[PDB]
């Protein structure tokens, strides 16, 4: 009954592929022929942020679209004004291998994590002046890959031992463990209503989970190699996905399948960052050949490139009003584009 | 100008830029060494031969005013290709390979590990100081057994020095870049001369960086 359970799994995934084929009645670019394109979208560097020394690994905007967190491997997690390019905090980490960062929707807390297997939660609005390590969450065994805040009270993390988790901050205890991946999960993105979230791992399988129940709702497997970045559509019903086979695909939640693959023949190196615009018409993708491609979300054509980095872009994100897109590479500079 | 009182804010910005600069200097005096190797290669023996939370075990010590950070990363039970791109800017990969390479095959496994880690796209110019432990065990193992079990195409004597130089050339033949190099040593009876070897080898790497950084190379 071991191979009987195996062939039963084959039976159910073949009927899933049957349902995905039977619900597929068109292609996406069958419908994009009527909508007029966007043309050349050139964007200038408005600010550059020369603060770090080692390579930058993560960036995250603030919900008032002005402040900014960058976490970089000089052992420094520094938060930034962006209108007048000041630095408003510089927090020295404990372990100088940091592969993620996060910034609270209320703007009070900053999460951090890396190869220390420990997600730290820094308070910012302390009465005593400076910042203090308020919580120190330590439950995984692999490294950390992405952290996001639901509110000031619970944080969902993604790890290197194939698991994700949801922590309660004020207790410091692993409230929920999500598992079901077969490789290292390397991205994370909440819904805009924060009811449910996706995570993409090193086995090309972006899984959609829900934070309230505690186990996987949907699975999407379209890529050929390791998923490295995920962002949602702004309506919450779709999400893009970049991987290290130089392509980035777009999946729907209700249609349960791939919809469109942005991949140009000139490109050979993978993604490190995917985001959207405010309306969702654009898509922003980082790369390893040191430039960032703007894509159409519908017409699948390259609408402009944002080059200007001596090393590969490792973080990217637009604000919550669509005004600017920040990016940050391993050259320690962190650019802003309009 | 026309700034209202946020010139105090840019005073704060200049102050913490100054602090970032000073800590960057103070951490740039350090010398970082990533220690690699397979499981049971003897790397715990060389890290206890330095005489000074389970992801990365760090060992900071110092010797002749050289702060050696030594990152032992063998606790990271995952795929290496997702965190060795943060271990560039290290100045050496210490590499330990045991000399009992006959069982569950090991020196073939250590050989594949070595030429996967030295032909890696990030360590294309970082130089591998290479250690070779368990040498008296190798002496007894050639005193009774042939290690052509590991090397079927080997020609030569069954003595210690020739076999040592043969496996040393086998390891040194695995690199292909001109601007990096491999040092070699034997250990496991060495009472802290290997730390002196680490010191002189890393000074050789630092003067080579100072040569090809100042354009004289």
């Amino acid at each position, epitope marked *: 009954e071991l191979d009987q359970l195996r062939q039963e799994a084959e039976q159910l995934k073949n009927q899933i592929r049957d349902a995905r084929k039977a619900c597929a009645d068109a292609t996406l670019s069958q419908i994009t022929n009527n909508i007029d394109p966007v043309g050349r979208i050139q964007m200038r560097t408005r600010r550059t942020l020369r603060g770090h020394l080692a390579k930058i690994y993560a960036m995250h905007w603030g919900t008032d679209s*002005r402040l900014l967190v960058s976490a970089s491997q000089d052992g420094k997690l520094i938060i930034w004004d962006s209108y*007048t390019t000041n630095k408003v905090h510089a927090i020295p980490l404990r372990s100088s291998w940091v592969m993620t960062c996060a910034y609270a929707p209320s703007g009070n807390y900053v999460a951090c994590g890396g190869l220390d297997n420990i997600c730290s939660i820094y308070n910012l609005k302390t009465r005593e*002046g*400076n910042v203090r390590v308020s919580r120190e969450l330590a439950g995984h065994t692999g490294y950390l890959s992405c952290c996001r805040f639901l509110d000031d009270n619970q944080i969902v993390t993604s790890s290197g031992d194939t698991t994700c988790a949801l922590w309660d901050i004020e207790t410091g205890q692993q409230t929920t463990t999500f598992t079901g991946h077969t490789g290292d999960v390397m991205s994370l993105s909440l819904a805009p209503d924060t009811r449910l979230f996706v995570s993409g791992a090193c086995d090309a399988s972006a899984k959609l989970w829900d934070v309230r129940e505690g186990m996987c709702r949907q699975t999407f497997t379209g890529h050929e190699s390791d998923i490295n970045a995920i962002c949602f559509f702004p309506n919450g019903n779709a999400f893009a996905t970049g991987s290290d086979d130089a392509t980035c695909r777009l999946f729907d939640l209700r249609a349960d399948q791939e919809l469109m693959t942005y991949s140009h023949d000139n490109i050979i190196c993978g993604i490190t960052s995917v985001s959207f615009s405010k309306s969702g018409r654009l898509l922003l993708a980082g790369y390893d050949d040191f430039n960032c491609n703007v894509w159409d979300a519908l017409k699948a054509d390259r609408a402009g490139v944002l080059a200007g980095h001596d090393n590969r872009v490792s973080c990217l994100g637009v604000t919550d009003d669509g005004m600017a897109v920040a990016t940050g590479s391993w050259d320690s500079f962190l650019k802003i584009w309009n | 100008t026309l700034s*209202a*009182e946020d010139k105090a*804010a840019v005073e*704060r910005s200049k102050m913490i830029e100054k602090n970032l600069k000073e800590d960057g200097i103070s951490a740039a005096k350090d010398v970082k060494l990533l220690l690699l190797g397979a499981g049971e290669s003897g790397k715990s023996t060389i890290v206890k031969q330095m005489k000074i939370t389970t992801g990365i075990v760090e060992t900071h010590f110092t010797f002749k005013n050289l702060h050696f950070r030594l990152f032992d990363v063998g606790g990271q039970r995952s795929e290496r290709k997702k965190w060795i791109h943060c271990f560039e800017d290290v100045t050496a990969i210490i590499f330990c390979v045991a000399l009992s390479g006959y069982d569950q095959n090991r020196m073939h496994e250590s050989l594949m590990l070595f030429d996967s880690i030295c032909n890696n796209k990030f360590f294309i110019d970082t130089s591998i100081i290479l250690f070779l432990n368990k040498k008296d065990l190798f002496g007894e193992k050639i005193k009774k057994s042939p290690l052509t079990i590991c090397f079927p195409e080997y020609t030569g004597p069954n003595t210690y020095e020739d076999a040592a130089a043969y496996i040393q050339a086998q390891f040194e033949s695995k690199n292909r870049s001109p601007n990096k190099e491999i040092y070699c040593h034997m250990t496991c009876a060495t009472d802290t001369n290997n730390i002196q070897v680490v010191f002189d080898a890393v000074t050789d790497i630092i003067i080579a960086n100072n040569l090809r950084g100042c354009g004289l190379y």
Partner: single-chain antibody
Framework: DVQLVESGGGLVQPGGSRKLSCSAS????????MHWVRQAPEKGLEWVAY????????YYADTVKGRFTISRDDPKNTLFLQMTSLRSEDTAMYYC??????????????WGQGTTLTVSSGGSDIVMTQATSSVPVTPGESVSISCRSS???????????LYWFLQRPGQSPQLLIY???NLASGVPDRFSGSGSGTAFTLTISRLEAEDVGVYYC?????????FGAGTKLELK
């Protein structure tokens, strides 16, 4: 908690020199900006001195400048006001104030308890008037006070640098409203403030017996910072 304990006052002979020492304990003192603010035995506040973080810039009031000096010993976390040539217009209570500045900070958030310098008997600043003298209040009611500047305060960056303090009788001045609409941290929510350009107002809704005292507005657009006269409230 955080502590600002200052010392060095007394019945001191005029024309001489004194020293005031503010010892601060409970926070990272070396990253704060420090103000010295005095006030008369019958009149309102007035700014006296300011030293930034790391002793970068030092600003004085023009009625005091040259005569005094201000310094800090941040390994000792103390703040010194060395005052020379003391006239009879310096008989005042003096407060040590912490006013950290970055984007979104709350300056003047915490105040010392004041020491007294009672000595014997021996120009285009942005003047700011509180046109109200004092009104009678009662609990259960809501009441709004006003403060009119001379120059418009809404600087080009989009801010409006007006601060509302409350000093309780026999106490130290708390901070109520910073930058004309942002509420302070720890103050109850029943206060609010707004205004436009030059003329501003503070609406306290559902007044209680704790919220009686004197209320000062203060600009922060440029140095010097001058306070209003301060409207007093009194119960029944």
């Amino acid at each position: 908690d955080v502590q600002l304990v200052e010392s060095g006052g007394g019945l001191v002979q005029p024309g001489g020199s004194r020293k005031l020492s503010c010892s601060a304990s409970g926070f990272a003192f070396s990253s704060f900006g420090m103000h010295w603010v005095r006030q008369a035995p019958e009149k309102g506040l007035e700014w006296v001195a300011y030293i930034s973080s790391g002793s970068g810039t030092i600003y004085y009031a023009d009625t005091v400048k040259g005569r005094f000096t201000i310094s800090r010993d941040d390994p000792k976390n103390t703040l010194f006001l060395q005052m020379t040539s003391l006239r009879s217009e310096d008989t005042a209570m003096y407060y040590c104030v912490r006013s950290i500045y970055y984007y979104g900070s709350s300056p003047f958030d915490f105040w010392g308890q004041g020491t007294t310098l009672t000595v014997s008997s021996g120009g285009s600043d942005i003047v700011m008037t509180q046109a109200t003298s004092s009104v009678p209040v009662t609990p259960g009611e809501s009441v709004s006070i006003s403060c009119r500047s001379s120059k418009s305060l809404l600087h080009s960056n989009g801010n409006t640098y007006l601060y509302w303090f409350l000093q309780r009788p026999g106490q130290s001045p708390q901070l109520l409203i910073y930058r004309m609409s942002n509420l302070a941290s720890g103050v109850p929510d029943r206060f609010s403030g707004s205004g436009s350009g030059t003329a501003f107002t503070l609406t306290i809704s559902r007044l209680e017996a704790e919220d009686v005292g004197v209320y000062y507005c203060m600009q922060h657009l440029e140095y010097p910072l001058t306070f209003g006269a301060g409207t007093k409230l009194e119960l029944k």
